[model samples]
Target: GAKCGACEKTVYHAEEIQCNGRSFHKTCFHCMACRKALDSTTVAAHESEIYCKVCYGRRY
Candidate 1:
């Protein structure tokens, strides 16, 4: 088991989304700006925060 990147709660394999060598829960993986859901293709990570490509480009 691994801890979720956002919530810091224990993560189980069944609902884990691994990104940037860290584990995230499906419900926890969303854009920090617009709250849009993300996947491998759409995810953009910045340090400890995660965002969608569109928002990432707009914000950073």
Candidate 2:
């Protein structure tokens, strides 16, 4: 089990999505700017926050 990086809740291995050594609940993993849903392929991490391509481009 690991703490979810997004929600700060405990997540079992079966329900956790691991990214960059951090755990996230599938539903809790969202873009920091727009709060849109994100998947492993579509999400980007910046300054410890997760973002979608559109938001990432805007920020960077």
Candidate 3:
């Protein structure tokens, strides 16, 4: 894809796309879905919709 779409191994983008009244990119935002980045290993895929390992699991 010439347009370089998001990935699956990193936090792509949040579901709401609004955090602290700002647009957090997929590579920046943590997985609020699985509560992973706030604590332990929460570094999710920044290519697909932002979802921690747990919440991301349900995405599929």
Candidate 4:
């Protein structure tokens, strides 16, 4: 089991969303800014934080 990057809880593969070489729970993988849900194509990483493409574009 890997710890979720966001919540720091144990994650099983079945419920995990792996992104940017980190693990997240399906329920935990949302944009840090706007709280919008994200998929692989829309996800953007900034160090330890995650964001949606639209928010990421606006921020940086």
Please tell me which predicted candidate would have the highest TM-score against the true structure.
4
Off by over 4 Å in 4: none
Candidate 1, 1-60: lDDT as tens digits: 999887758988978988878888888878767889887877888777789989889987
Error of 1 at 25 (Å): 0.3
Show model 2 residue runs off by greater than 4 Å. none
lDDT of 3 by residue, 12-48 (tens): 3443234434445444456656545532245445444
State which candidate, 1 or 4, has the greater TM-score.
4
Error of 1 at 29 (Å): 1.5
lDDT of each: 0.83, 0.80, 0.46, 0.85
Ranked candidates, highest TM-score first: 4, 2, 1, 3
TM-score of each: 0.77, 0.78, 0.32, 0.79
* Model 1: pairs clashing at backbone N, Cα or C within 3 Å: none
What are the RMSDs of all candidates, in order? Answer: 1.7, 1.6, 10.4, 1.6
After superposition, candidate 1 runs with Cα above 4 Å error: none
- Candidate 2 lDDT, 1-60, residue by residue in tens: 788886667977777877777887777778768987887789998657788998998988
lDDT of 4 by residue, 16-35 (tens): 98887888999989987889
Pairs that clash in candidate 2: none
- Global Cα lDDT for candidate 2: 0.80
| lDDT of model 3 at position 11 | 30
Q: Rank the candidates by lDDT, best first.
A: 4, 1, 2, 3
- Worst window of 10 by summed lDDT in candidate 3: 1-10
Question: lDDT of model 3 at residue 19?
Answer: 42
